[PDB]
Amino acid sequence: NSIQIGGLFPRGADQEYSAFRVGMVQFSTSEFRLTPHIDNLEVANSFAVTNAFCSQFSRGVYAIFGFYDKKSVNTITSFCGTLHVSFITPSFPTDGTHPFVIQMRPDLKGALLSLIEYYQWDKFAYLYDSDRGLSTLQAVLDSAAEKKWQVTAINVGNINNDKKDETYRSLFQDLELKGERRVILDCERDKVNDIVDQVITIGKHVKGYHYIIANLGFTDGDLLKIQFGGAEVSGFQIVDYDDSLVSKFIERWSTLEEKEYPGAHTATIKYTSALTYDAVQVMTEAFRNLRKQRIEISRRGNAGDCLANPAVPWGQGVEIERALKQVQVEGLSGNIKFDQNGKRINYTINIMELKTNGPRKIGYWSEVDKMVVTLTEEQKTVVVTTILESPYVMMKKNHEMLEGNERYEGYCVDLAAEIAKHCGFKYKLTIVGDGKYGARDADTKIWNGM
């Protein structure tokens, strides 16, 4: 019962393949064993993807687990749709109806929009790059037109890293111009970190700013940078470490040696890698459900050339597809189930906020219930501005010998003493700079005076 399954790991992806192997070990059974053929490539390269896919095809794999990019995703979808070969991916969900594709990643749109509705954001700024596609952009734009939102859409992906210093400074300058504080970062974690560093550098992480990171990796990255910055930061988490399953898995993960499994010694795990593990689970359970239903998918002969025209798909493929789509299992991503098209259903996205002490879950998001909230949670010297007028505020004859509030005498001085006495605060009497009571300048439209 050797089941050949192809796989595609982008060069530099370690923890993903590590969790893949861990999945191979944990979900292995005496009944059947998966025989992976791993192929590393350049994921952004369409040619490389095509070559690897046809390589796995000619090898006669019954399923493929891999990743795609905004460039290469259409190649994967089209080829898998044509040759009826099932593809399992942690990578971003495709917007549309794509057959023979199983997307492990949940759709983040609803969680995000409900988050915007929760924080009651009338106007905000949306920073995006074209990596995972502009689907989310379209979503928030249509929802902006529907709910009467004023949204600033800015593409941060087209700015070159070599020349980008003052570009972001000008970006946040123009963003500070309108007094717009609320900001949403939809980006790959690297670009996120860059933008973060630029923010702390420009001091935009101070109080008054609210950042929303849109991804499932909110706690996977370093939050210590802006943690003490004083700006509120919110995000989404697909992995709950309080769960017993995830906790034990984490114990086994953290006990593992780093030499054998690269980057596998950690307190946490990137959500992509977790999605990979759960993907292994889904494949195992799928073929198990195939064996229990007594259906033999075994290949009679070699697949031949994938490019051979006219392309002919195998019959078994559809059966394997249905087998995968009908799977419902419990995993690190929560409840795992798919619809007819292969997208995730009935998932749970934990809504989390970054606090002083650290990150915490303020709620959860469901496909039906939308946002649901979890457990609800000296004296400074008072500056007194005043102007010189008799007998309200006057300089004492000996005033040069004195300092502070002892310098001034008058009705308003005594009144100030009384007010401070009743309200219980320490007060510092100061004379206004411009020497005006108050006014609006007809030119600058700026208020002058006390």
């Binding site: 009338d122 309108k178 717009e180 504080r181 609006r440």
Partner: protein
Amino acid sequence: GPADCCRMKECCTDRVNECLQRYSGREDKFVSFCYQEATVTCGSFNEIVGCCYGYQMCMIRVVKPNSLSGAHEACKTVSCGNPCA
């Protein structure tokens, strides 16, 4: 140029709203300030009354923090009353 009370109204609501937008989340506090700025920019027949008084009042009593958009959308059609005294 010639004054148009109608143009004055439309400009008034627009400038008030656009003003309150920078003050988002503190919006309920700055209604009168932005109304002052709008009265300055769009002009007024009576300096005390302002460009549109009824809209000002409606906004002042209705507007809640972050509730701006709906509030303005509700209040912009409101009658301005007599811009004399």
